[PDB]
Prior knowledge:
The PDB classes it as translocase. Keywords: Complex, membrane protein, translocase. The entry is titled "Cryo-EM structure of TOC-TIC supercomplex from Chlamydomonas reinhardtii". Chains A, C, E, J are Tic214. The organism of A, C, E, J is Chlamydomonas reinhardtii. The structure is cut from a larger assembly and holds twelve protein chains of eight kinds. With 60 residues, chain B is mainly α. Chain B is 57% helix and 0% strand. By secondary structure, chain F is mostly helical. Chain F has helices spanning 14-32, 49-66, 92-98, 101-105; strands at residues 42-43, 72-74. The longest helix of chain F has 19 residues, at 14-32. The relative contact order of chain F is 0.08. With 122 residues, chain H is of the alpha+beta class. The radius of gyration of chain H is 17 Å and the shape is elongated. The chains are: A mainly alpha (49), B mainly alpha (60), D mainly alpha (104), F mainly alpha (116), G mainly alpha (166), H alpha+beta (122), I mainly alpha (101), K mainly alpha (91). Chain H binds chain L through residues 24, 57, 59-60, 62, and chain L through 43-44, 51-54. The complex binds 1,2-distearoyl-monogalactosyl-diglyceride (LMG), 1,2-dipalmitoyl-phosphatidyl-glycerole and dodecane (2 copies). The site of one dodecane has 4 residues of chain G, from helix 7.
Amino acid sequence: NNNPQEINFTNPPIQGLNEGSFLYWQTEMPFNSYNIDQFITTNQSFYAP
Amino acid sequence: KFMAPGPLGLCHAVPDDPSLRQEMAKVAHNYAAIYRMYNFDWDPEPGTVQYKIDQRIRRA
Amino acid sequence: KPLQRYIPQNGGFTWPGDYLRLEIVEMPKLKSINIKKTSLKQKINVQPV
Amino acid sequence: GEEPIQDELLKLLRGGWVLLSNLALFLVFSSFLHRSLNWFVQTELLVAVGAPQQAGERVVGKFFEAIEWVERNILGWKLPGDEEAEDATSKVYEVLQNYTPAEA
Amino acid sequence: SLVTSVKDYVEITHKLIEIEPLKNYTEFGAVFTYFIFSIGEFFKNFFSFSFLNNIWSIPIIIPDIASAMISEVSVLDGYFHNAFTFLETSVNTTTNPSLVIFEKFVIGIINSLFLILPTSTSHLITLRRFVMQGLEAGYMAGLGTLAGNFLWLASIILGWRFFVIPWLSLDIFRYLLGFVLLVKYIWDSSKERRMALEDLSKWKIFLLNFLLALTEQSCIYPFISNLSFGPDASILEGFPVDNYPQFLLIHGAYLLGILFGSFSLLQFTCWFWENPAFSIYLWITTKSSLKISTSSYYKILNFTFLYATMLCAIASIPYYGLDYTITNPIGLVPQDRILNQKKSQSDPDKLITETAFLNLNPTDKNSRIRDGVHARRERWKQRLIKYQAFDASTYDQGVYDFLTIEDLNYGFDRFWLRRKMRNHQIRFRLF
Amino acid sequence: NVYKGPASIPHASAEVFGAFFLATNTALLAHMFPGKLFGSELHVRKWDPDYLASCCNEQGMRREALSGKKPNLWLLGGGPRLVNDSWERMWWNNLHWKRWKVPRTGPAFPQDMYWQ
Amino acid sequence: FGRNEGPMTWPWKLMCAILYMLPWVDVTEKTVYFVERFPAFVWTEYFSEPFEHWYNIHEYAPLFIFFATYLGIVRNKKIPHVARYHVMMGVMLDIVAMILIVTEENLPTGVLWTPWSDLFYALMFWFIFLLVIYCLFFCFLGWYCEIPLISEGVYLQIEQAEQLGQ
Amino acid sequence: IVLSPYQYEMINYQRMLMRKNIWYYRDRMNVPRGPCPLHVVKEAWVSGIVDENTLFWGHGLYDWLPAKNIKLLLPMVRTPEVRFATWIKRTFSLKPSLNRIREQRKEHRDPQEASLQVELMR
Amino acid sequence: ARTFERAAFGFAKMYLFCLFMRVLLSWFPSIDWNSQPWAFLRLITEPYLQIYRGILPPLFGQLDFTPLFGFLILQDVVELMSPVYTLGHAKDTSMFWTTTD
Amino acid sequence: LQHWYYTPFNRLLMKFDVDAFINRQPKSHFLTKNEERALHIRRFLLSE
Amino acid sequence: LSGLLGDIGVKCTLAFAGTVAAGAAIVVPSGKQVEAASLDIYGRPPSQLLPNERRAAEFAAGHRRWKGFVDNSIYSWTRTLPGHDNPIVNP
Amino acid sequence: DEFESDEDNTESEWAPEYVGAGLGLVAEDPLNPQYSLRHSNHPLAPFPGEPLKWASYVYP
Ligand SMILES: CCCCCCCCCCCCCCCCCC(=O)OC[C@H](CO[C@@H]1O[C@H](CO)[C@H](O)[C@H](O)[C@H]1O)OC(=O)CCCCCCCCCCCCCCCCC
Ligand SMILES: CCCCCCCCCCCCCCCC(=O)OC[C@H](COP(=O)(O)OC[C@@H](O)CO)OC(=O)CCCCCCCCCCCCCCC
Ligand SMILES: CCCCCCCCCCCC
Ligand SMILES: CCCCCCCCCCCC
């Protein structure tokens, strides 16, 4: 609320992930989802042994 | 400067707020509880916990 | 193998919101016009989705 | 006896400028040596393995690549095979638009 | 900065995907036009005096309990809570304000002692001037360092942030200015220029110390030049007051006392260096032991002063690494993403070669083992030639795996791991 | 007797080189052993810049509050940038200044002595 | 006199810097023993690699360089004096580095198997490094840097290189 | 006291482990206070802000402990200059101020008075 | 007899050190050879270098390299008479059966 | 060679420096082995 | 003073300044941001735009001017001559 | 040969123990039960190799 009108930040908090975005922050995320790891054989086998 | 955990803190006075005083008392109690686990007495007085601990050690 | 460490790191070459969109990745592009006999000079590798 | 202050300031500026310029030139040369070591190493290995013709071809190929860049960028006309090579690499967002499935 | 402009250019290039895509980031036309725009805008801002509209201060507003961390707020016994807010400093006033003003004056007079302790570079320069160039040069140097210290202390105590904050923001310029000043002084002293002092020479002597008092200089004997005869940590901290006139009176009295004490000490030193002898050190040495001569004594003293000022000049180089002195003014943050960015998805080499020596783990690959390089021998890591088998980490940063701390840094493990350095070899230089 | 070059081009003595050599060696030795330099140590600076900034801000805010106006806080590095994307970009200058706290103050060399 | 005594220009400064880079290549092996302390000089480990490759491409390159510089440059009296002085200073620094290597090769085993050797190694780098830096500070500037026990011999050798066989 | 070579080498190893540590300490309000290298700790010790009873944390520990209960923290701080300066600060600055504040305000009960200033020198 | 070889090698190393000192002192022409240390050194080192002075003339008649040549030749000769296994790390025969040894 | 590396006459400077460093602490902080074991036992018994 | 022109550094600085001046002369837009760039890329008046958007519009206008200049002045002249056999790398 | 004529099977290679909270364990040294955690990755395991660090992480 710096200015008298409130300003909402769009980019700063990420609320989604795609292939390139995952590749950019691969080792900086706190969790991994199955929706992207299902396309790798070893990762999928680890998810569903 | 009363928040300084040293001799400098004693030189200055607290802002006279009962809730702040209670908070400081609780913090001091926690600090003393931590302190008692690493510093002991060479000759404990009878009637204290450390005295009975020493008695049990000698009996063992 | 050297162990990977998952520590978030601060911005570089871009503001924290985005990633490198215009990075060049070696993958062939297909023309809509049919090419009867023309090697792509780079196999598309795993073909099925 | 004592020179004016501005004279000393000018002398200091001149000396500092000369020193910094020479240091910058030396560092640029060192950076050039650092960046292009592997190319000379590969040329030397090609020479040593017993194929001097390959090394000469590599050198004249670098020269012809410079000539090709001069033709393509400084001048206007294109070169044969440019369209075929233009479809060999693509940007990441283009890959996401075309090849990447929507389930990921 | 450079990095900010690069980020802005990258953002602009990303914005243009929708309207007119670019072939890649490093098109000559786009880079050229953005460089021209940046240079033009920078020079326009520098020339138009539009930098006076920059913002450095913000207001601080305390949020109410509704907008605060309500989960932290807890009611104890139904009568108190943890939302602490006390009315800054409230102290009962003394019986007479004149008494506390006099007390502050005396305290300032006492505190002025620590400013003139001969433990810094300016004191060394003043001492050398007193010894070599007479009394006037030393008096001028002392007056200059006194004026500089008084200006800095008054700016800090009276809260003149408009000068303090921007000046402290220029991190490396203040180091470079000090280096230049010390280099010029060292050369001038080395050439041994001697002549009758004029007004211009005296003003140069004054200005040298005045400018040197505004930089960070090497100090010997700390924890003693920072003492103060009061319940504070230094001499720059103020005192609590109740209103604006009392604030002004108390702080003016403190500054006046400091200035009076410093001036009295300067006058005492000026008289003392004349009382016994202009150069009494020669007589003291003669009393202590045998004296060689006067010319040799002057040569030894000049060499000692030159060595001391050289030490004061170059003492600060090992303290800071190149990441804080070179990459920081460019615009990079520590452990930046630019350092570790790879050249391409297929090439593991780093993009920026000029900064490839920063933040290297002991398990990183060695670049001198490439085919056909024939680089230096590196006998100390013959058994571990595939890695950079040495630890040079700084601060908290440091990682270890399958290359333990003991092997790298401790005892016989490190010594035994480099046993190839002490192996005799057969060599014939001529035959 | 020997030529020793023209007199127009300046010459550096040997005393300056000796002083530089001894000064470098003594600086390294003094940095290695903090407690042996006549019972004292060698300090690069006198006061930390953050300490000076905090004291100056405290005094300025006190003076402004006593004068009847809302106090302001002066930031090291610069003010905010009017942007609508992310919070880090808006306050990039102050964050950049604060992120160099450890390198700015602490020494790069080890503080204590090993092997001796 | 007919000898040139004008100031040195930038190409001579670059050549002299490249020449000065030789003892650094000779003593670059012992940089780690010093860098382990005071990590701020860690960059000094990674700066000489191309020079190490180029100066060691042939086993007899240093002798060829010495003979091409002493006869082709130092002997000539039409080259400015400062350039010859700096070339001879670099050659003498290389000689000093060779002397240090030779005296390293004959260390006793008792000193070899003690931490003293490490200290020695560090010094073998550090001193040399200082010299080079000092010379470089007076190489980009067209000035004369004087070093004890070396400069006088260099001054004599410059004029002995002249009137050689004449 | 006669130390064995075992103790000498153990002390050397511990000094090796802690030669790059950065310390933290806690105040009366239970808030961590500042990134503290060795010289900052020495300055705080000299100024009378911290003492041997302050809670400190370093790299080699798991919890916050009193400063005198950490293995090698007091020998590092207590150089002879630090001892002389802290003695001066205790004797000539803090003690008279404590006496003055005790005399000025009755809220400091005479029967129950702390003796932290007396032992600051140690 | 190990003592014989030990004494011979020690004497050879001392003579090599003397020759190296002569090579170093050849750089300074201001030294006087009538002083006791320099006189003793030149008295010890005179004949071996005197032989090479006759054997090898100066390359151009202006520069002298005779002490350096003598030092190099003696260094090679003493290298010829080094112990077969100098221990250190040599007598351990490196690690296992090796291509080098 | 590892045993010879830590021989007393090869560690004199380390001994001097460690003595100088360790003499800085108060004399009452030195403890016997039995006292240290007793303190450990007291700590864990007090925990119980 | 010709003495200043004698030094290499002064010549290099003058050449750099002249190149910068020519670039600014040929790429700096004027009145084409609101007319073409701003409305096309944001559909808003330049004044209402955020400070980081006005720079983008100005960059777009400058890039359009640069491409127009490089097509209508240099490439027409250098392409009036047809492809002169287009030499290619033989190896 | 010990180093080259022997390999470790997939199901027989050494791995650190799993102790969970490490409460119920047989104490090899009764006085110090922490000595039994030396073969695991427990937070209170003696001498892990890399000191535990005060991490302050902000994720994307
Ligand atoms: C977005 C822009 C960000 C870019 C940031 C640029 C940082 C560059 C700043 C200039 C630094 C100068 C170093 C350039 C020297 C080239 C040598 C080289 O590339 O070596 C590159 C080597 C790294 O070498 C690489 O190392 C790797 C390690 O895995 C591998 O071994 C590789 O094989 C090897 O090539 O780095 C150095 O040797 C750095 C030397 C630095 C010497 C100190 C300079 C002293 C003078 C400083 C005075 C200031 C200079 C001007 C600074 C301001 C410039 C604007
Ligand atoms: C080489 C690097 C550049 C060095 C150049 C020197 C920069 C020096 C800047 C300050 C010098 C003084 C300018 C007056 C500075 C000035 O007048 O202040 C102007 C200042 C501006 O007030 P604002 O509230 O607009 O400013 C906000 C800032 O003050 C931030 O707190 O007003 C006050 O601070 C009033 C202070 C109470 C009134 C104080 C009166 C007592 C005056 C005592 C006179 C002492 C003389 C001491 C001399 C050593
Ligand atoms: C704009 C009013 C005149 C200038 C007032 C003094 C500003 C000094 C700033 C110094 C920063 C280094
Ligand atoms: C008593 C063992 C030898 C002591 C001196 C060895 C290190 C000397 C360093 C000289 C470097 C040129």
